[PDB]
Amino acid sequence: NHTAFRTVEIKRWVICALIGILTGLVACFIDIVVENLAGLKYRVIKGNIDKFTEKGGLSFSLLLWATLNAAFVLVGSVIVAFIEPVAAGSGIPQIKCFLNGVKIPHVVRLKTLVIKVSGVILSVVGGLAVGKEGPMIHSGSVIAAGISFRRDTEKRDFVSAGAAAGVSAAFGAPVGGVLFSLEEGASFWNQFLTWRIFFASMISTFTLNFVLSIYHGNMWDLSSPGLINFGRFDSEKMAYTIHEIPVFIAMGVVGGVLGAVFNALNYWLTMFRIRYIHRPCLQVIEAVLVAAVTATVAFVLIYSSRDCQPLQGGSMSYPLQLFCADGEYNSMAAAFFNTPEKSVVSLFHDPPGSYNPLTLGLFTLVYFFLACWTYGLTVSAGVFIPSLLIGAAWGRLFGISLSYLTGAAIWADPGKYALMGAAAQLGGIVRMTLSLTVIMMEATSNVTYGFPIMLVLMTAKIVGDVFIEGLYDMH
Amino acid sequence: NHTAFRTVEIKRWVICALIGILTGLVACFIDIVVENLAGLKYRVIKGNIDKFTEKGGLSFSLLLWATLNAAFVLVGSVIVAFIEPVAAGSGIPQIKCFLNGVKIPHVVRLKTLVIKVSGVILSVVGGLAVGKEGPMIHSGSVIAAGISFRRDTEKRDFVSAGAAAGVSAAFGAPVGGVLFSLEEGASFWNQFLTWRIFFASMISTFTLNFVLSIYHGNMWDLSSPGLINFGRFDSEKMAYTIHEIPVFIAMGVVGGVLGAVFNALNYWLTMFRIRYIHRPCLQVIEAVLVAAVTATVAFVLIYSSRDCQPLQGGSMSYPLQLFCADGEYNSMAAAFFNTPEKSVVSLFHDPPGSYNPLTLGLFTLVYFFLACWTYGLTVSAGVFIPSLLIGAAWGRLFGISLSYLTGAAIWADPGKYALMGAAAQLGGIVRMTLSLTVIMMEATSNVTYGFPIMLVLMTAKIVGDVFIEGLYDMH
Amino acid sequence: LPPDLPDLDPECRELLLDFANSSAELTGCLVRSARPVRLCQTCYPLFQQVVSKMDNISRSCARSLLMADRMQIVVILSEFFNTTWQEANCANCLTNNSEELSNSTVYFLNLFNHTLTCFEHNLQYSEVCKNCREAYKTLSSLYSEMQKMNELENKAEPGTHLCIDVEDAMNITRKLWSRTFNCSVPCSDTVPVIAVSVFILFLPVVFYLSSFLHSEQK
Amino acid sequence: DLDPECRELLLDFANSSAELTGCLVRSARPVRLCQTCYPLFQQVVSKMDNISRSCARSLLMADRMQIVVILSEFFNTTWQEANCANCLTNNSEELSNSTVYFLNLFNHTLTCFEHNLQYSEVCKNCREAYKTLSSLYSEMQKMNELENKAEPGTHLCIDVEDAMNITRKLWSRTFNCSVPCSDTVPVIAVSVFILFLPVVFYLSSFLHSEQK
Ligand SMILES: CC(C)CCC[C@@H](C)[C@H]1CC[C@H]2[C@@H]3CC=C4C[C@@H](OC(=O)CCC(=O)O)CC[C@]4(C)[C@H]3CC[C@]12C
Ligand SMILES: CC(C)CCC[C@@H](C)[C@H]1CC[C@H]2[C@@H]3CC=C4C[C@@H](OC(=O)CCC(=O)O)CC[C@]4(C)[C@H]3CC[C@]12C
Ligand SMILES: CC(C)CCC[C@@H](C)[C@H]1CC[C@H]2[C@@H]3CC=C4C[C@@H](OC(=O)CCC(=O)O)CC[C@]4(C)[C@H]3CC[C@]12C
Ligand SMILES: CC(C)CCC[C@@H](C)[C@H]1CC[C@H]2[C@@H]3CC=C4C[C@@H](OC(=O)CCC(=O)O)CC[C@]4(C)[C@H]3CC[C@]12C
Ligand SMILES: CC(C)CCC[C@@H](C)[C@H]1CC[C@H]2[C@@H]3CC=C4C[C@@H](OC(=O)CCC(=O)O)CC[C@]4(C)[C@H]3CC[C@]12C
Ligand SMILES: CC(C)CCC[C@@H](C)[C@H]1CC[C@H]2[C@@H]3CC=C4C[C@@H](OC(=O)CCC(=O)O)CC[C@]4(C)[C@H]3CC[C@]12C
Ligand SMILES: [Cl-]
Ligand SMILES: [Cl-]
Ligand SMILES: [Cl-]
Ligand SMILES: [Cl-]
Ligand SMILES: [Cl-]
Ligand SMILES: [Cl-]
């Protein structure tokens, strides 16, 4: 009767409230631990580099950086490759399959959550070109399937709420998380189920915002709705006209082509790894070698970079002065030392002329292949943030080129085109458009920017699908 | 047969693009004509009042105001009562019925669109306590069913795109429009259909924003995504913590209780109108009398108001000075002369010492009953904006009391509670909660306020359903 | 050391000193003209001197004085002086040539003086509004017409302010007229307003009652 | 007009702001804000407070263009951004000992450069004088963060920042004295060896799988 239905229904809302609360807490734990561990690692590296800069022996600083990257990834890859291989990657395809209806072994076990959270912490601290936002979706699903109603029909509904809560916590987009659970579900419309999914999604982003606020002491300020916060786009500089619509469509073509190349190289690389690097010992060695190479390539770019500009208010978290004048700090070092989320935010909101095209171009080309190489490693890590960083990097270069070509026109704001470039790369790579589109508006907090973003994403998807077919036919 | 599918699908996207374009154009036509006609009407009334203020004869100004209100509503009610009775009201229940599956005659005929657009223009210009945003949903549905695929299933999908485009144009919430079409549809998930709904909704808000900018002269600032634009809520004064969450829950109870009284009063009033005012001639006379009373009740409040403060820059368009010092406009006059959308914006964003509690309280009490009395009229008009204005009015009063009771504490910002009060009244009146909340986050462009908005809206619905059950039982 | 970093270049030392006393004069004239507001009619020569001096210093001393350091004192001070001029809005009521007050402003100030001096000898406040009422009426008509001239000749925005000295002149007159002199115009239209309002408010009562009574039988 | 006793507060504030604005300009190219006319700012804020303490109503908010308010806000904003509080003691009556110590060290560092001008001699005569000045400036930076609990180390007193930036620009841009030890060959050898590891790993795994 109604008494039995209401008793069950309130427990569903109670459980989905815990799913959102715990998903936000896990995101807080990941963000706090990564920030403290990466800060400790970069302070050691920066201190060692500064000691050897004038006395000599910078090769030891490179060795220390590579060893520190390898040591963290060694732990982060051993636990994934040897204990729970299911934790490898962002875990979204496993979650998509679970919501589809096919059960992959060891996806929603409590051991997977521990390894996924530990793996993503060590992988991000390990210096790999990865992002921690992607695995947060898998973490929410495991919390939902463990906290929860011991039957398949209810469990899938809870997992959808957990996955939605993970998306909301990762990007601060509670509506985008609900959309993500909706399309992956692709079932009959349930008003109550969609309601408790929304309740879990919004509880999740509030818990992340609230707990991080008390961590920063700034309780009277809630400015961290997600793991990555794009900032505020309420600027006359961040305004577009109808004449820029064809330009934005062109960026989608670039994002679709680059995304197809990103997937093409990663596809051939994946086939190589399946045939030859399938043994768990080899996967651990490969992940360690990638981490060592990532530090080596970063050091070489920093060492050979001759462009450095004076410290701003918050340009660098760890300003590295190397071979140039006192009071100035390496610009290329800031690209690698700063967190990828911080780099994306700075690219989105920066006055024109803040980035030298040469150092930004070199970083974009190197990071594009490092991110492509890093995906597929037997580590718990995502690809959304590297995709965002790659797109924002070349999107800013597109804005820089437009300003040069149009005589520093007002409408040619590099920051605006960085946002368009970030969407184009995300669109051309993940090929998920609806939930992605809602995420950008919620991240940017600008409805008017939805229309160019929607066009850019739509262009990237159709171009990427056509180009992927063409590349495979040529091969 | 992929070629046949592609040709059919591209035509669906082409049609859904026109639905969004035409829905935005209709919103532009409604907004442009209403502001020009209401501007001409208020200039005539203001000029007449200022002429008789010193020489005497203000009763003639009251007669002119009542006659002008009656004349516009007489035309707006004759075309609805005598020609197309289906166009009466906001048309939301008719669209929900159509998307449900049961077809009401003449909902989606071209003549209905002409009557609906003309009726909403005349009713708003006629001074009725109504809003033009609500009927915009019905207008989009009729455009979709006329532009369009001559079969029932395709018609329902296209109409849902038009209804979604109406919500996006009305409120600048393209995602909220998609959500509104999904629940009112309540069918199996369709990835491509939800794409066309999202495409049409997103084009509609861009077309309205783009064309209004052309009309407003300046073009490099698309600052009007929808018919009603809340503004920007990025202020240190506009922030909250956990301690204010129970306060918001209490305000949700007030909105639900007031919304229940709003519905209960309108239910008994509707029962009277069906039994006794069912003739088309009486419906026209009733609408004319309400318009005359609305002008008269506005006049006596403006006449008897002793509160006038000097012009603090903008915030009006027709500053009426009555019986007090030169250089100061009457505060109560600005409440009625200003458009309800503009009044809501001023309530949301204003210094904590801008509204007299007595002046605002008297307006809220009168406007609450005027809006309740005006709902069942045989005119094309919505109730969303009046409910927002009522909620923002008493929400601001709640914030004013909190400042007095907490010694002008920094967390008791009246503007923040005006927004929360606006949601409480809107949620407790329409009881539509999942689509409504998404609109508020899109309207305010602040995901951090989604959580208090969610709790306030959820609280209002729960107490509203309980109270109407109790109130009906008592009767 | 080169005469750039540690010490001022003699070419730039004198230019900075010239801008120093010009800014000192403007700031002193700004304060002493704050109340009653005679800002834009007395400090206009000083403001032009400052902006001319800044232009002279900025196009052989632009790079070594303006952006040579983080705290660009010369830049921020000129920005503050410019911001004060714009918010005071003396651009509109200064002539296009900008050597003196426009004809409108001169015509307003002398009437403002005439209105004020008329108030002074009517005290020794019933006699003030009994006799000096047309003087206030024509001055207020001019100010209302001045707004419309600003909305048309300038066409900035509805509600845009004129120069602050003109606005302060009217606000002083209005405050004198309505607050201290307590000269208010009585209204005897309350009774006709109530009679018409009551009649209109009573119409829906008749309409609803008549409909109910008519439908009571057949 | 105001009372004759109410026109004296405004006139005193008028010349006080006039002379403060004069010092702000004539102490701008070599930035000497917080050490030249710190009392003049104190005199201005004291004279403004005297009005706040029977003329506040008739001078402060008596009209729309609050000239006295905005001028005091501008002076306060300039004082805050210049961080002149950091330059003076907590009592804000004279320059702090650390600032005075830096200023004479800055004089001594500039005293080096004139002697060794008559650029090889400058770089190898009293390089430690520049080194100890930079050590103090870094020391004062971290002390500043730990003193007022500022989250980053960004902005000191503008007198100190300008004094060091003049020294740094002289030492690096005008003089070519910075000589960092660059081990390009060891860096290349180590970086090449590490970058050559994935080539070995991918080839060895490919060849090991072949022929089992
Ligand atoms: C700052 C932090 C977040 C860095 C992460 C380092 C450790 C806290 C992590 C890394 C590896 C983790 C371990 C990985 C695997 C296991 C085995 C697991 O035991 C089992 O039940 C499985 C045993 C098996 O089958 O081998 C219990 C958790 C534990 C100890 C984990 C505990 C947490 C560890 C030590
Ligand atoms: C064997 C395969 C698998 C990898 C080959 C890698 C090379 C193409 C890279 C690795 C190290 C690189 C070098 C690292 C550092 C330098 C020093 C750099 O010289 C400076 O700019 C020195 C002064 C300064 O530090 O600014 C010029 C580039 C160069 C030779 C780089 C050239 C390109 C090198 C040889
Ligand atoms: C290239 C720069 C600008 C960015 C830094 C990334 C590289 C260090 C990575 C990206 C992709 C990697 C490559 C991906 C695949 C291969 C193929 C692999 O096997 C073969 O070449 C033989 C295969 C066969 O015989 O079938 C050898 C390593 C190599 C070149 C990898 C070496 C390291 C690469 C070049
Ligand atoms: C400032 C105001 C007073 C201007 C008037 C605007 C509207 C009130 C007018 C303008 C166009 C008119 C429409 C023009 C054409 C028609 C078609 C007409 O249809 C018929 O010929 C059949 C009528 C029937 O038999 O029911 C019905 C009236 C209608 C909708 C008219 C209704 C009144 C409208 C909307
Ligand atoms: C018959 C039913 C259906 C309607 C009853 C309406 C009354 C309750 C309203 C209508 C007009 C109102 C009056 C309108 C104006 C005034 C003038 C006001 O006093 C003034 O003279 C102030 C005006 C001024 O000088 O600015 C005191 C309230 C009063 C009598 C109001 C009292 C309440 C009245 C009579
Ligand atoms: C606080 C007020 C001044 C705000 C403005 C709104 C009123 C002018 C409106 C709102 C509801 C209206 C009322 C709605 C219903 C009725 C009941 C109706 O009478 C009956 O139905 C009698 C039934 C019977 O005798 O059985 C007479 C009109 C009246 C009072 C209406 C008169 C006008 C009212 C009071
Ligand atoms: Cl995966
Ligand atoms: Cl990912
Ligand atoms: Cl990610
Ligand atoms: Cl309806
Ligand atoms: Cl509405
Ligand atoms: Cl409505």
Residue pair B88/B378 in contact by the 8 Å Cβ criterion: yes
Please, which residues 135-164 of chain A have a Cβ atom closer than 8 Å to chain B? none
Amino acid identity, residue C186? P
Q: For chain C, how long is the longest CA-to-CA vector?
A: 111
How many CB pairs lie under 8 A apart between chains C and D? 130
The two three-digit tokens of residue B380, written as one number: 């094309």
CB contact under 8 A, A220 and B210: no
Which residue's CA is the closest to the ligand 2 atom numbered 12? D188
> Solved by what technique?
cryo-EM
Q: Which chains touch C (3 or more CB pairs under 8 A)?
A: B, D
Q: Which of A199, A216, A233 is the last residue of a domain?
A: A216
Domain contains A298: yes
**CA-to-CA separations, B341 to A390, B226, B443, in angstroms, rounded:** 42, 11, 13
Residues of chain C with Cβ-Cβ distance to B52 below 8 Å are: 189
Rounded-to-integer distance, Cα B125 and Cα B35, Å: 8
- Supply angle C-alpha A100, A102, A107, rounded to 5: 100
CB contact under 8 A, B185 and A189: yes
Rounded-to-integer distance, Cα D206 and Cα D203, Å: 5
The SS3 assignment for D177 reads: coil
Which residue in D171, D173, D187 is closest to A303 by CB distance?
Answer: D187
C141–chain B Cβ distance below 8 A for any pair:
no
Which residue in A53, A276, A277 is closest to D180 by CB distance?
Answer: A53
Query: Do A262 and A162 share a domain, yes or no?
Result: no
Query: Do B159 and B261 share a domain, yes or no?
Result: no
Domain contains B442: yes
Query: Do A128 and A190 share a domain, yes or no?
Result: yes
**Bridge partners, A330 (sequence order):** A308
Q: Are strands B328-330 and A308-310 parallel, antiparallel or unpaired?
A: unpaired
Which residue in D15, D33, D78 is closest to C28 by CB distance?
Answer: D15
Query: Do B262 and B171 share a domain, yes or no?
Result: no
Query: Do B273 and B199 share a domain, yes or no?
Result: no
Distance from the alpha carbon of residue C205 to the mean position of ligand 6, in angstroms? 7
- When computed from its CA atoms, the radius of gyration of chain C, rounded to whole angstroms, is 29
Closest residue in chain C to residue D81, using alpha carbons only: C71
Please, which residues 143-172 of chain C have a Cβ atom closer than 8 Å to chain D? 161, 164, 167-168, 171
Query: Do A58 and A180 share a domain, yes or no?
Result: yes
Q: How far is A302 from chain D (nearest CA, A)?
A: 12
**Bridge partners, B329 (sequence order):** B309
Query: Do A305 and A195 share a domain, yes or no?
Result: no
D58–chain C Cβ distance below 8 A for any pair:
yes
Residues of chain C with Cβ-Cβ distance to B289 below 8 Å are: 203-204, 207
Domain contains B103: yes
Residue entry with tokens 């978290």: A317
Amino acid identity, residue D179? V
CB contact under 8 A, B447 and A172: yes
Rounded-to-integer distance, Cα C102 and Cα A435, Å: 62
The answer to whether A318 is annotated as binding is: no
Query: Do A192 and A246 share a domain, yes or no?
Result: no
Closest residue in chain A to residue D137, using alpha carbons only: A327
B68–chain C Cβ distance below 8 A for any pair:
no
Q: Which of A181, A216, A251 is the last residue of a domain?
A: A216
Q: How many Cβ atoms are within 10 Å of A458's Cβ, its own excluded?
A: 18
Ligand nearest to the CA of A91: 7
* Cα dihedral across residues D61, D67, D68, D70: positive or negative: positive
The answer to whether A90 is annotated as binding is: yes
Amino acid identity, residue C155? K
The two three-digit tokens of residue B449, written as one number: 């306020």
Atom of ligand 6 nearest to the CA of C201: 8
Interface with D, mutate which of C15, C19, C71, C74 (most D CBs under 10 A): C71
- SS3 for A380-415 is CCECHHHHHHHHHHHHHHHHHHHHHHCCCCCCCCHH
Rounded-to-integer distance, Cα A393 and Cα A396, Å: 5
**CA-to-CA separations, A252 to A249, A347, A371, A453, in angstroms, rounded:** 5, 18, 20, 9
Amino acid identity, residue B371? A
The SS3 assignment for D95 reads: strand
Query: Do B266 and B395 share a domain, yes or no?
Result: yes
Q: How far is C218 from chain B (nearest CA, A)?
A: 11
CB contact under 8 A, A58 and D152: no
Which residue in A194, A202, A441 is closest to B451 by CB distance?
Answer: A202
Distance from the alpha carbon of residue B315 to the mean position of ligand 8, in angstroms? 47
Domain contains B256: yes
Closest CA to B302 of B121, B130, B50: B50
| Binding pocket residue ranges, ligand 3, CB within 6 Å | A 269, 293, 297, 365-366, 369-370, 373; D 198-199, 202-203, 206
Which residue's CA is the closest to the ligand 1 atom numbered 27? A111
Residues of chain B with Cβ-Cβ distance to A206 below 8 Å are: 448, 451
**Bridge partners, D88 (sequence order):** D95
Amino acid identity, residue B464? G
Domain contains A222: no
Q: How far is C127 from chain D (nearest CA, A)?
A: 23
Residue pair B356/B334 in contact by the 8 Å Cβ criterion: no
The alpha-helical segments, DSSP class H, found in B56-190 are 58-78, 92-100, 110-125, 135-147, 152-171, 174-185
Domain contains B427: yes
Mutate to test the pocket of ligand 2, among A62, A300, A358, A369 (most ligand atoms within 8 A of CB): A300
The CATH number covering residue A439 comes to: 1.10.3080.10
**Helices C73-88 and C44-57, axial angle in degrees (round to 10):** 150
Closest residue in chain A to residue B433, using alpha carbons only: A195
User: Please, which residues have CB within 8 angstroms of residue A456's CB and are 6 or more apart in sequence?
Assistant: A248, A249, A251, A252, A255, A420, A423, A424, A427
Residues of chain B with Cβ-Cβ distance to A241 below 8 Å are: 219-220
Q: Is A256 left (phi over 0), alpha (psi -120 to 50) or beta?
A: alpha
Interface with A, mutate which of D181, D185, D200 (most A CBs under 10 A): D181
Ligand nearest to the CA of A81: 1
CB contact under 8 A, C207 and B285: yes
Closest CA to A112 of A133, A134, A91: A91
Query: Do B87 and B192 share a domain, yes or no?
Result: yes
Rounded-to-integer distance, Cα D78 and Cα D70, Å: 12
Say if residue C192 is preceded by a cis peptide, omega within 30 of 0.
no
Distance from the alpha carbon of residue A401 to the mean position of ligand 8, in angstroms? 30
Phi, psi at residue A433, to the nearest 5°? -110, -45
Residues of chain C with Cβ-Cβ distance to D114 below 8 Å are: 1
Please, which residues 47-86 of chain D have a Cβ atom closer than 8 Å to chain A? none
Domain contains B363: yes
**Bridge partners, A261 (sequence order):** none
Q: How far is A448 from chain B (nearest CA, A)?
A: 6
The SS3 assignment for B308 reads: strand
Q: Which domain holds residue B266?
A: 242-311+323-474
- Residues C3-9: contacts with CB within 8 Å, 24+ apart? C4/C64, C5/D166, C5/D169, C5/D170, C5/D174, C6/D30, C6/D110, C6/D166, C6/D170, C7/D30, C8/D29, C8/D30, C9/C61, C9/C64
Q: How far apart are the first and last CA of chain B?
A: 63
What's the domain count of chain B? 2
Query: Do B101 and B195 share a domain, yes or no?
Result: yes
D86-103 burial code (b ≥16 CB/10 A, e <16):
bbbeeeeeebbebbeebb
Query: Do A169 and A251 share a domain, yes or no?
Result: no
A411–chain B Cβ distance below 8 A for any pair:
yes
Rounded-to-integer distance, Cα B251 and Cα B456, Å: 7
Phi, psi at residue A384, to the nearest 5°? -65, -50
Domain contains A407: yes
CB contact under 8 A, A175 and B173: no
D38–chain A Cβ distance below 8 A for any pair:
no
* Cα dihedral across residues A293, A294, A300, A303: positive or negative: negative
